[PDB]
Amino acid sequence: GSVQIVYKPVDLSKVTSKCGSLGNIHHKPGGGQVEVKSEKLDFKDRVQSKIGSLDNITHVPGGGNKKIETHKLTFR
Amino acid sequence: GSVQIVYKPVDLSKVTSKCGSLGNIHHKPGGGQVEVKSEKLDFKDRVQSKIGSLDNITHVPGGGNKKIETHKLTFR
Amino acid sequence: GSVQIVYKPVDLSKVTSKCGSLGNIHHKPGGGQVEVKSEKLDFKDRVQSKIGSLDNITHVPGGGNKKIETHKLTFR
Amino acid sequence: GSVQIVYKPVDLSKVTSKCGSLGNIHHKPGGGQVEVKSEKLDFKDRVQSKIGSLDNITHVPGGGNKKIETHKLTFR
Amino acid sequence: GSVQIVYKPVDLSKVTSKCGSLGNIHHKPGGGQVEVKSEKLDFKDRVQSKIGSLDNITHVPGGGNKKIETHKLTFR
Amino acid sequence: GSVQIVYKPVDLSKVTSKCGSLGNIHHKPGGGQVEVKSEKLDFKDRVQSKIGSLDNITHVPGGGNKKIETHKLTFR
Question: Which residues carry the site feature described as Not glycated (chains A, B, C, D, E, F)?
Answer without folding.
Answer: 8, 14, 18, 28, 37, 40, 67, 72
